[PDB]
Amino acid sequence: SGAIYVGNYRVVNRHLATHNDWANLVWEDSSRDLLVSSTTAQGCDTIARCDCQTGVYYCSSRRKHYPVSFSKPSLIFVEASEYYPARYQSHLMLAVGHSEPGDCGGILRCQHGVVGIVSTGGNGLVGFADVRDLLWLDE
Ligand SMILES: COc1cccc(Cl)c1CC(=O)N1C[C@H](C(N)=O)C[C@H](C(=O)NC2CC2)C1
Numbered sequence: 727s728g729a730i731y732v733g734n735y736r737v738v739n740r741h742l743a744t745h746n747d748w749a750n751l752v753w754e755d756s757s758r759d760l761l762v763s764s765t766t767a768q769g770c771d772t773i774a775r776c777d778c779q780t781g782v783y784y785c786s787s788r789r790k791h792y793p794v795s796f797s798k799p800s801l802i803f804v805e806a807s808e809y810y811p812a813r814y815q816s817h818l819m820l821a822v823g824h825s826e827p828g829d830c831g832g833i834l835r836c837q838h839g840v841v842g843i844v845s846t847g848g849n850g851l852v853g854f855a856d857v858r859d860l861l862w863l864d865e
């Protein structure tokens with residue numbers, strides 16, 4: 727679990743969105759595993775606007791942050807799950823690192839701010855849903 731709080735927006739994994747997130751829906755994209763809902767309180771985070779390929783992510787299954795090298799946002803085949811059929815997930819960045827299903831929502835950050843959130847993983851891999859292209863989050 728985990729979310730990004732920027733301005734009056736809350737960004738979460740679409741598969742983990744609550745009834746309240748859907749009741750206050752701003753935007754969602756099943757192909758990216760992202761959902762954005764509106765909030766009444768001002769958010770704590772800054773979004774990176776960069777092309778960094780190194781950063782640090784929080785891994786809740788180890789209670790630790792790990793430094794990673796990650797690929798550029800791209801279309802990656804993701805296996806079938808309880809929430810989605812076998813499909814290509816877009817704007818996904820892969821890295822070598824530990825992750826478990828419950829790590830989804832852990833934030834990936836670089837020196838410029840929030841890059842994305844954990845969305846996929848397996849066998850010593852971790853995938854992050856990019857948010858740097860969502861310029862409207864800053865206004
Ligand atoms: C960090 O995730 C993992 C890490 C290690 C191994 C594995 Cl199988 C995962 C899990 C993974 O890849 N998905 C990705 C998927 C998607 N974004 O399309 C959403 C999936 C889902 O339905 N989760 C709910 C709790 C059961 C979980």
Ligand SMILES: [Zn+2]
Pocket residue numbers: 774775776777778836837838839
């Ligand atoms: Zn950066």
